[PDB]
Design an enzyme around this catalytic site. Structure first.
Site, mmCIF file in Angstrom:
data_model
loop_
_atom_site.group_PDB
_atom_site.id
_atom_site.type_symbol
_atom_site.label_atom_id
_atom_site.label_comp_id
_atom_site.label_asym_id
_atom_site.label_seq_id
_atom_site.Cartn_x
_atom_site.Cartn_y
_atom_site.Cartn_z
ATOM 1 N N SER A 169 2.341 87.359 25.418
ATOM 2 C CA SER A 169 2.576 86.577 24.191
ATOM 3 C C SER A 169 1.842 87.259 23.037
ATOM 4 O O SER A 169 2.080 88.456 22.793
ATOM 5 C CB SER A 169 2.237 85.093 24.491
ATOM 6 O OG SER A 169 1.709 84.313 23.410
ATOM 7 N N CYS A 198 -0.320 80.254 15.445
ATOM 8 C CA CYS A 198 1.134 80.314 15.391
ATOM 9 C C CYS A 198 1.615 80.868 14.059
ATOM 10 O O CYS A 198 2.536 81.696 14.023
ATOM 11 C CB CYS A 198 1.723 78.933 15.647
ATOM 12 S SG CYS A 198 1.626 78.464 17.361
ATOM 13 N N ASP A 250 13.439 83.069 28.238
ATOM 14 C CA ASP A 250 12.153 82.811 27.604
ATOM 15 C C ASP A 250 12.457 82.141 26.280
ATOM 16 O O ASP A 250 13.135 82.724 25.435
ATOM 17 C CB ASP A 250 11.385 84.129 27.394
ATOM 18 C CG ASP A 250 9.990 83.931 26.792
ATOM 19 O OD1 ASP A 250 9.795 83.035 25.942
ATOM 20 O OD2 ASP A 250 9.070 84.704 27.155
ATOM 21 N N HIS A 299 8.515 81.549 30.080
ATOM 22 C CA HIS A 299 7.604 82.281 29.207
ATOM 23 C C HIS A 299 6.264 82.567 29.872
ATOM 24 O O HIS A 299 5.535 83.456 29.411
ATOM 25 C CB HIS A 299 7.395 81.472 27.913
ATOM 26 C CG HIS A 299 6.514 82.132 26.896
ATOM 27 N ND1 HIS A 299 6.819 83.340 26.309
ATOM 28 C CD2 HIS A 299 5.361 81.712 26.321
ATOM 29 C CE1 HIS A 299 5.877 83.651 25.435
ATOM 30 N NE2 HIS A 299 4.982 82.680 25.426
#
Length: 267
Positions: A96, A190, A217, A246
């Protein structure tokens, strides 16, 4: 830097070997997300684990919002950890946001990164003119609003979508660490990820790379893996996991460990 940084980010070195591997977790987890793949690696490798400064397992008063408004500051932490441990060469496994961190770190210090393994990996999440990243601006604005208006409800809804496959224990585990993140830090991470665009620098990566692709994902369209293979500057392969999600290190750790053992065999 130094011993204080090793303390603050919960650095742990386990296993042994001349093949050093760093495991670097993604958004909403901490280093415990590697706990089920870890026993497949520690007989053969010296494994370095650490928590990103945004992890709920790190004291959130270390999170400098000004400093961490770009990913290069997370890169600085990773490099300072490896320098403090006196490690001159390693393989790096990043999930990620840590896949982005690993790309940037391998460009900053090509001597240090002998191989990258990228999980849940994308160079850019927002769509562009001829680029499918998977997200639109208006959509992420609503996500950011939901994260602020009711972080707990947002996290409860996000956890099963991120896990993807119906694996209740993995949803519970990801939820635990997501709920552990301070809501303002989670939103800030984020926002930082969504403003990052690594497409232009992919060709600067010199390390060989394995891109791990699952069958779906929520954050990474299937076409992104081929984009990474076409544009990363090192010898790159895509390895295909026969399940979705994911967070394969939580939901299918035995399958992911097969890929890791192969990818970490020689570098």
């Amino acid at each position: 830097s130094g011993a204080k940084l090793l303390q603050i980010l919960n650095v742990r070195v386990v296993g042994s070997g001349e093949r050093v591997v760093v495991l670097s977790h993604g958004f909403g987890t901490d280093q415990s997300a590697w706990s089920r793949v870890l026993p497949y690696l520690t007989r053969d490798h010296r494994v370095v684990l650490y928590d990103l400064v945004c992890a709920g397992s790190v004291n959130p008063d270390h999170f400098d919002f000004r400093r961490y408004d770009n990913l290069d500051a997370y890169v600085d932490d990773l490099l300072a950890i490896l320098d403090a441990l006196r490690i001159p060469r390693c393989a790096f496994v990043g999930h990620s946001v840590s896949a982005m961190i690993g790309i940037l770190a391998s460009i900053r210090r090509p001597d240090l990164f002998a191989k990258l393994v990228l999980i849940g990996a994308s160079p850019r999440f927002l769509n562009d003119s001829d680029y499918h990243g998977g997200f639109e601006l208006e959509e992420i604005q609503q996500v950011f609003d939901a994260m602020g208006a009711n972080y707990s409800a947002w996290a409860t809804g996000y956890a099963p979508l991120a896990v993807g496959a119906d694996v209740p224990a993995a949803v519970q585990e990801f939820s635990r660490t997501l709920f552990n993140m301070r809501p303002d830090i989670s939103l800030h991470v984020c926002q930082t990820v969504f403003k990052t665009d690594l497409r232009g620098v992919l060709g600067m990566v010199r390390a060989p790379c394995v891109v791990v692709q699952t069958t779906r994902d929520v954050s990474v369209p299937a076409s992104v893996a081929a984009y990474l293979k076409a544009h990363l500057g090192g010898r790159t392969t895509v390895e295909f996991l026969q399940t979705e999600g994911h967070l394969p290190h939580l939901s299918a750790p035995s399958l992911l460990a097969q890929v890791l053992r192969r990818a970490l065999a020689r570098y």
